[PDB]
A paper describes a structure:
Although monomeric in solution under physiological conditions, SpoIIE590–827 had undergone a domain-swap dimerization during crystallization. Here, we solved an additional structure for SpoIIE590–827 (with an amino acid substitution A624I that was designed to block domain swapping) that was in a different crystal form and was not domain-swapped. Importantly, the only significant differences between the two SpoIIE590–827 structures were at the site of the domain-swap. We hypothesized that this structure represented the inactive state because it lacked the dimeric interface of the SpoIIE457–827 structure. Comparison of the SpoIIE590–827 structures with SpoIIE457–827 revealed that dimerization rotated the switch helices (α1 and α2 of the PP2C fold, corresponding to SpoIIE residues 630–678) approximately 45° as a rigid body relative to the phosphatase core. Our structure of SpoIIE590–827 reveals that in the monomeric state, V697 packs in a hydrophobic pocket between the β strands at the base of the PP2C domain and the switch. Based on the universally conserved architecture of the catalytic center, the M2 metal of SpoIIE is predicted to be coordinated by the side-chain of D628 and the carbonyl oxygen of G629.
We investigated the PP2C family member SpoIIE, which controls the activation of the cell-specific transcription factor σF during the developmental process of sporulation in the bacterium Bacillus subtilis. SpoIIE is the most upstream member of a three-protein pathway that activates σF in the small cell. Like other PP2C family phosphatases, the catalytic center of SpoIIE uses two divalent cations (manganese in the case of SpoIIE) to deprotonate a water molecule that serves as the nucleophile for dephosphorylation.
Residue numbers in the entry: 587 to 629, 633 to 817
The structure:
Amino acid sequence: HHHSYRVSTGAAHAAKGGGLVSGDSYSMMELGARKYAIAISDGGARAHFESNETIKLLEKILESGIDEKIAIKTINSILSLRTTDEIYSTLDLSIIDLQDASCKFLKVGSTPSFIKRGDQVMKVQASNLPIGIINEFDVEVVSEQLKAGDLLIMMSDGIFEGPKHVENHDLWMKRKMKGLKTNDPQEIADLLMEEVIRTRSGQIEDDMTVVVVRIDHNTPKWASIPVP
């Protein structure tokens, strides 16, 4: 009934041309008992109902205990159905188990997620499943074991691709995450945003969005620290 881990979260979001409403969507929600779920998507009132619904489906498959290849082709089937061509939407989705700190990620697109553990910053990525096996949406499904203190950073394509005069976007983000010293999720969100906006001198070509989640021990409020 009491969870061993807890989550602290932050989020920054900007719109095209310094606008007031963005078309990036994100959500971070408890998802039943012991899980916690983070999602970002790019690509209407009814639209965000259909999205949340497909996200719910993808959630349940991700959590089903199914082999990763099967999940991949199942998810492709789901997406082919209830999607058209001429819709090129992206989705990064991560779900943390709040008892063991295990985590399942699912990626559709070319925008990378990252874990920061101390001074390492790992890009979370899956292999191309072998040739001859089709993958219509280049869906990726990765499982990692997290530890307390870990940062998880997820971003929209607009912010990943945002830094001007920068050829390797992956490596630029990597560096900028390495260079942070704060462990605050929200400070980290806002800092990353400012670094890419600084690079384009204030102009905002796309909706830009990043969420950060720190993973902590769920230590009761009344606890005191112990000493050496």
